[model samples]
Target: FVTLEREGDEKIVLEKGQPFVEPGYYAEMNGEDITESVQIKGSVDVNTPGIYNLVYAAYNEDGFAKTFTRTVYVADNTASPLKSGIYTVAEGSKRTAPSVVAFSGYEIVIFQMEPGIFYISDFLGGWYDQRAGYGPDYAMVGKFELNDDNTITPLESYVAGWGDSMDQMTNTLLDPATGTLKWTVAYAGQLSFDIIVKQ
Candidate 1:
């Protein structure tokens, strides 16, 4: 009799740009170690988005065989193409508080601390400090969660350079058509800004 033992999840899921670590398998025939005789078919490519299958087969001395299948799903589900880079404010973007003015030429920096987390610098396009007379020294960092749909969920922000939190008026959404990001940052519970950033 032949037996095959597979390791790892039967259905594996991976995001693009990520490495796929193969979980191995074991095989035995008639209580004898026959792992060397096992054969695996098919492969997984993490770069391409598709469904793949790996087949493991082992045979006994009597020609009887045991087989197992593992399905791998390589998906492009991350908020990539949004890597650590400096983005420029759109020509028409502006802040809602302080009477709204053209917010062009300002730069916003995005740092991808990891796959699903991002650190945004100057979330208000540097307008809050520049216009509020706080200057550039008081600009703060905010941590955001990057969603599978390419949306950014703000966790909390700074208040007067303190630990006090600010709120996100709305989620930062990615513009599929223009490849831009629209962000809304509200600070001090009174001031807010709406800006579009282009990579």
Candidate 2:
């Protein structure tokens, strides 16, 4: 009888269009660690965004072979492409219901704070990093990331003099064609619209 062992799980979940954050797996037989003797066969295209399969086979000295099948699943990486530039709080919609929300009547700068990382300006200047030179006295700094459907979610935000990083805005949608951004956020707590347009 041939027996094999798997490290984490039979199936490995991966995000599509992104690098695989795994370093393979381990195998053992008869209490003997034969991870090096294991041969992996199969291919996974991380860019294609599909389901793939991999087969790992390990053999013993007695010519007995134990085969273990591993499933490679590639999923969508929600943080999609984003356009980095300057945007101002535009007055596109003032429809507020369910909660009394307020939108910024001023402008804010959106830039790549780091490689693949996105950020928005704070009231005073900056926070969480340097979206602004100085974080707002009342407004918390905002760190955001894009979604698959051209929407953005604030990953972190903190107000000056306050040390709590929280979410005050909902999904911020971007219209690439017109450089328009629409957001339904909770200002301080009340529901509001925080729309932005490229300047």
Candidate 3:
């Protein structure tokens, strides 16, 4: 079974004239036959931006039935872009690195300095046999700074996709002086671990 959620929104925004499909479990839906395949197919219109629901039901041989439902949200793309912000780290500050172990997996290292600087690297290459097409073999380095209240905001984000020998780095400007943080990482394909230091 799998569930999905939009990264930063309360509901998913379906474009007009788009189809929506959801997977479900047989037992939960009271399927009549355990061997029956489960499938969902539907679509939404872009003309109207609103909330909707996808309801499902099924029954078993013993005269039992069950139903399940999920909510879908449609939004107008014409509306002003949503206020989205990037994650950041401060130099010299201690913070956990976000780890990713799947294809296109990513990890983030944070620095505690006033205007934070950090790195986002991909570990998708080291996990599988590089010769056998395991990794995209790419890494991304980024820099971020803190807002007035110490919220880190990303300033520069760059990506280095596969086939690059040299690691990539970008420079960032700090509006104010703050502490310095240093960090290193060991990334094995999709998995990553880190060591941090503050000065």
Error of 3 at 20 (Å): 2.6
Candidate 2 regions exceeding 4 Å error are 1-81, 93-105, 123-135, 162-168
The worst-scoring run of ten residues by lDDT in candidate 2 lies at 123-132
Candidate 1 segments whose C-alpha is farther than 4 A from its true place: 1-79, 130-133, 159-163
Ordered from best to worst lDDT, the candidate numbers read 1, 2, 3
lDDT of each: 0.71, 0.57, 0.34
Q: What is the lDDT of residue 63 in candidate 1?
A: 66
Taking all chains together, the TM-score of candidate 2 against the true structure is 0.43
Candidate 3 residues 27-106, lDDT tens each?
A: 33332344243333444444554446554445444755454555454433432212112222322321123543222222
Report the candidate with higher TM-score, 1 versus 2: 1
- Which portions of model 3 show Cα errors greater than 4 Å? 1-11, 21-43, 83-199
Clashes of 2: 10
Candidate 2 lDDT score relative to the true structure: 0.57
Cα displacement (angstroms), candidate 1, residue 111, comes to 1.6
- TM-score per candidate, chains pooled: 0.53, 0.43, 0.28
